Amino acid sequence: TFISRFAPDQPRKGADILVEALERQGVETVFAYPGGASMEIHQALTRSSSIRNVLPRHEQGGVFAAEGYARSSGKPGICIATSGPGATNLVSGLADALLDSVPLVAITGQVPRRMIGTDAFQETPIVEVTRSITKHNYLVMDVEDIPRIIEEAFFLATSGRPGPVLVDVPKDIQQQLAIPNWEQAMRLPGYMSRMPKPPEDSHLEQIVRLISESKKPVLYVGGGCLNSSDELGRFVELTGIPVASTLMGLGSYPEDDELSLHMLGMHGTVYANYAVEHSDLLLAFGVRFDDRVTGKLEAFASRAKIVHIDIDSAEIGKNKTPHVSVCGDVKLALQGMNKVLENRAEELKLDFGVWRNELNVQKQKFPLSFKTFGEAIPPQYAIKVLDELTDGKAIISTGVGQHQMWAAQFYNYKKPRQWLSSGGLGAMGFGLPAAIGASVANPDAIVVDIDGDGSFIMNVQELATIRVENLPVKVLLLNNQHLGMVMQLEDRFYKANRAHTFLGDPAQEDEIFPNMLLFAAACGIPAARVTKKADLREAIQTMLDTPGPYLLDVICPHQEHVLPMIPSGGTFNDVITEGDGR
Amino acid sequence: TFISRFAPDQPRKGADILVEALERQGVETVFAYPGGASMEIHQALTRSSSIRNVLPRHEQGGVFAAEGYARSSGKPGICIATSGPGATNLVSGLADALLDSVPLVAITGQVPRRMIGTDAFQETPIVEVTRSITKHNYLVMDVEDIPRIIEEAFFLATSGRPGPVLVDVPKDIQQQLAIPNWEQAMRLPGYMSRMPKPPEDSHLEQIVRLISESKKPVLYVGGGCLNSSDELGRFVELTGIPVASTLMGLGSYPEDDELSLHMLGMHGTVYANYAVEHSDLLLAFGVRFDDRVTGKLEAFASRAKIVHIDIDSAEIGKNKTPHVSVCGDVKLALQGMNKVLENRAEELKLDFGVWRNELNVQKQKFPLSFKTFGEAIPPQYAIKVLDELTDGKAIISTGVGQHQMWAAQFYNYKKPRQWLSSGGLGAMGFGLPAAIGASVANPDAIVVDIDGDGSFIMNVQELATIRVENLPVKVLLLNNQHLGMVMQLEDRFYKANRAHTFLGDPAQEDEIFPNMLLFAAACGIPAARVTKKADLREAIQTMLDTPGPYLLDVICPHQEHVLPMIPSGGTFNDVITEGDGR
Ligand SMILES: Cc1cc2nc3c(=O)[nH]c(=O)nc-3n(C[C@H](O)[C@H](O)[C@H](O)COP(=O)(O)OP(=O)(O)OC[C@H]3O[C@@H](n4cnc5c(N)ncnc54)[C@H](O)[C@@H]3O)c2cc1C
Ligand SMILES: Cc1cc2nc3c(=O)[nH]c(=O)nc-3n(C[C@H](O)[C@H](O)[C@H](O)COP(=O)(O)OP(=O)(O)OC[C@H]3O[C@@H](n4cnc5c(N)ncnc54)[C@H](O)[C@@H]3O)c2cc1C
Ligand SMILES: COc1cc(OC)nc(Oc2cccc(Oc3nc(OC)cc(OC)n3)c2C(=O)O)n1
Ligand SMILES: COc1cc(OC)nc(Oc2cccc(Oc3nc(OC)cc(OC)n3)c2C(=O)O)n1
Ligand SMILES: Cc1ncc(Cn2c(C)c(CCOP(=O)(O)OP(=O)(O)O)sc2=O)c(N)n1
Ligand SMILES: Cc1ncc(Cn2c(C)c(CCOP(=O)(O)OP(=O)(O)O)sc2=O)c(N)n1
Ligand SMILES: [Mg+2]
Ligand SMILES: [Mg+2]
């Protein structure tokens, strides 16, 4: 029983209809940056008592914060921008949310209807630009269509395979008066008809059948699981199959468990890629078979019968052709297969201890390793220390680079929606704003940002947003004075020829630049820098215990390399296990 | 006689062909941020001895710096980005360069040809996204086409009406070996055939004819003039017609001259809009009749015969229908009309002293005015002081907002290419990177950035670029703790209801936030803050005399309003001449 602030017979502005339409969808947090074409919307947001606005300092920071809000909770993220330059600053966020299937609803202002197509002031064809980087977009041509389009936007963004949905609203529609009809039926015939049905017992019983016939099975878990945390763990108890995870599926199965193969792929563990290489049954749940995971598709699980479950029928059979396939929710497939395994438990007699022992051998021979040089701080050890002091209960958001991979390898995530990282697009500067959105969605959680000196400075303006909104965002900056991921490839494949990968000052080459502590000091945030490995544990303990935001600059030797590394398009036999830039 | 670093029979990489193709076009400065899909290009840039790379800290700062490089010199600006998130950060810059007709050539990396359309790693359909915000774009499908596409890109970007041209290059093309053929003929049949011809004497002699028949003529000068600085001044000597300028045409005719009406339009002077309102002949040279200038098109020059000269045949007759029109270069039209006026000088007997005196009356009755409150610093006076101490010889780049309009009103630009401001798109954060590009193109010039606290913080990361590259960029920050332009409209049309327009900290409301001095201190840039009007002259003198970069924080009362102001879509009779938020 929703309670409106307006009478059922009282005409109100279109912008007031839009805000009420958001309140009916359960929205309580938006990330809106004001502008000329959206002042009516901002005026209507102040009249709302149930919607809080987090004002960012850059629209790209607003859409990245909406992603973190969605990645860390499951709700859709809502950001609002003005026309022209406000809308074009959302492009990096929209393309990222599509590639990583993040529920997102972006609302942008627009010049009045009678001015579109005239090269007007702050006018850009935002619908034609974003048509290829959104799940769907709309252009509101009448104030009557507002209640229906908003309903379709939150539906398309959260149902099926989630994604971003943009809604462009002209200024004259925000000012027009009307009486909204909240009983509108959605105009999505072809989308709802193609929606996946619950899985058939005919398909599910052949999956359980293929498991008992298999000797070396591996679970290939990805970003589609997330909501299926419990169902997946229950499925592993009954089968005892090792679990390999993608960058997006971290936390779906706890990393501290003994059955965990951790991450597989290009920078995946040797034992996880080994299990896939010498498997006969591959259970690919919620994955899309990225080239970061497979490399050469002909050598990826070459001797394995492949089972693929995905809610998007377009993804099944795109790169790798499976034997058995199931189009639907992985959460329902696991529930249906758990029932088959409990009833016919003694009939199956499932035991893979020989396959697990063969992997435990490789898990002991080729584990994740890092080197300590004197008193310098190895970045991997800094994350292990953060893992200890937070007990693995912290929400981690990262940038893109070496620090990103190390944040995945050397932290054991226990639950999903704990790991926020741009994996598909790989957008730098994603970290700090994503931590802002997660801290708003999870106020009582430990939100720690693991950025690099290059990624951190891109959206460094959002430190003002952190202080103004008083968020307990912890920034664990791994400063290596370089663009690490690009520098690592220069050492291997370009004879260490530096090509604009140094971020410091060449005049004072042995001086840390910039002085990131003064960046936090400008925004009134307490900061500290640690350089010696002995002082590391006390420095991170200070960051966590200090109430409110905190910045910790951790200086690292730039010669470190992320390992292991299967080169681009290579096979498991081409894996690199040792090497650095010294 | 170009000298290559390779033999005519020596195969080289496609990336090396691309760099040599740039050297043949006269490129000597690029703004490239490295990434995975463009490392081959960065490797080839180090091998070049004639091309300098300015590494930014954000790709949006790189494209905005390429605009300032082009706006302040006339050369085309060249920025280079990686695929995926690197390319999508150029969108705000591409849309801006198109709306303001800035010659721009953007090169982006891309996943190899065999991976486009597979949702690959860091893969975005950059050609389909930017098709509507660029003059043209390309997708290189063969290493053979590189010498031709680069030639067509620099041709399309600089000829006719300038604009941005994007070139997407897959990674496998950068690595492929080939022998370039530099004798390729461009494949632009339809574009070159539609190119404008030199103006006919039949058209030009009717223009001179309409001038002698007119009693109240006004010159409507815009961004198309720029290159025609001398020809325009010579044309005014012979006719004696007052010159009104757009935001983009500032400097085309010197603002310190007595015949100058300064800027017209929404925030234009009362006397400039008056001359247009009561004119009988309007000479519109290099303008596009924006709604920021005209408002209601039926009342704009309602009693005037309109002469329009533009190099784009699509712009003539778009909004306002002219009597006489000339499609071609305004520089050639002025040269042809100057010859007509010198020969038939005594035959015409041109004198408009009665019309000029009628305007000099309005110029004295309604001049640009500002109020001084106690010892507070009025922002308009700060720009007047900067105008004095630099003798109007400084290259000025601004953000978007109140400080932008005041930088246009209270500074008398003497030559074109001195005023760098996003007018068409109106993108915030454009200022500081644009000052970087101008300082690289004009090393011995006085480059001063007039930013607002909101616009400055968006691309504040570029201060590291200023220090590392050791550029003498002066930052005149007009901090009013608010988003001024949005706050001004709240006071007039929304009863001063603040809707997320305050940038400071609500906990410490009377504390300047953020402390912008520490932002410069982090990047090792000398900074200072001035608050009292008496200390203002000494503070700006310190900024200019200090070698290298300098930041000056100028605190202003936020209640100031930009005046005059013709409201949106209004006429000259609706002009607002007084008012503020007190
Ligand atoms: C520098 C860098 C290095 C990287 N290295 C690696 C690496 O080594 N290993 C690695 O794995 N990744 C790596 N990545 C990330 C990589 O690009 C992809 O993000 C990742 O490989 C793909 O994740 P995914 O398979 O879980 O698919 P996702 O992008 O997470 O998509 C989820 C899939 O499940 C489906 N799905 C969604 N919801 C449901 C549901 N409710 N029910 C059923 N199905 C659903 C979706 O349709 C989709 O097909 C790296 C990224 C970067 C920037
Ligand atoms: C907050 C804000 C307030 C603003 N207020 C105002 C205002 O009050 N007044 C105002 O004028 N603007 C204002 N603007 C800017 C405005 O949006 C436009 O930028 C401006 O009005 C249009 O400039 P222009 O007429 O010179 O056309 P331009 O954008 O500069 O285009 C140049 C025209 O000349 C043509 N041309 C180009 N080269 C040549 C050549 N070589 N020969 C012949 N023709 C050529 C082009 O085809 C084009 O038609 C404001 C912007 C902002 C952000
Ligand atoms: C942020 O500060 C500013 C500045 C400014 O011009 C200086 N304008 C706006 O609002 C718009 C934003 C975008 C387009 C606009 O054009 C417009 N909007 C209308 O709304 C009804 C009507 C209109 O008629 C010409 N033009 C307008 C406009 O308000 O003019 N905001
Ligand atoms: C599968 O075959 C190939 C071949 C190829 O070039 C011939 N490229 C790609 O994908 C990329 C797409 C974009 C950037 C790329 O380089 C790259 N890849 C990374 O993966 C971790 C990281 C990185 O650091 C910036 N650069 C790569 C890359 O695989 O080299 N795949
Ligand atoms: C916006 C953007 N630009 C460029 C890249 C390419 N890129 C770049 C430039 C990387 C180096 C990141 O440097 P960092 O300091 O932030 O992190 P590390 O040095 O620890 O790897 S990683 C990577 O994929 C990108 N992913 N996103
Ligand atoms: C990227 C972006 N976002 C929003 C806007 C809308 N906008 C905004 C938010 C303005 C206020 C600018 O604040 P400022 O501090 O930088 O300058 P002043 O307060 O002196 O006007 S002006 C304007 O057109 C914009 N033009 N560009
Ligand atoms: Mg780094
Ligand atoms: Mg301001």
Numbering used by the authors:
A (entry chain A), B (entry chain A): 86 to 667
Please, what does the article write about this entry?
Acetohydroxyacid synthase (AHAS), also known as acetolactate synthase, is the first enzyme of the branched chain amino acid (BCAA) biosynthesis pathway, and is the target for more than 50 of these commercial herbicides. Since the introduction of these herbicides, 197 site-of-action resistance isolates have been identified. These sites are mainly focused on just eight amino acids 1 with all located in the substrate access channel or the catalytic pocket of AHAS. Here, we show that these mutations can have two effects (i) to reduce binding affinity of the herbicides and (ii) to abolish time-dependent accumulative inhibition, critical to the exceptional effectiveness of this class of herbicide.
Next, the crystal structure of the W574L mutant in complex with BS was determined, showing the overall position of BS is unchanged compared to WT AtAHAS. As for CE, the structure revealed that the binding of BS is strongly affected by the loss of π−π interactions when leucine replaces tryptophan. This correlates with the loss of affinity (150-fold), this despite the fact that the two other aromatic rings contained within BS make numerous conserved interactions with the polypeptide the observation that there is only a small increase in B-factors for BS when compared to its binding with the WT enzyme. As for CE, the presence of leucine triggers the rotation of the heterocyclic ring, however, to a lesser extent. Indeed, refinements of the structure with various products (ThThDP vs ThAThDP plus peracetate) suggest that ThDP in this structure is a mixture of ThThDP and ThAThDP/peracetate. In agreement with this, the kinetic data show BS can induce accumulative inhibition in the W574L mutant. The results show that the W574L mutation abolishes accumulative inhibition for all inhibitors except for BS.
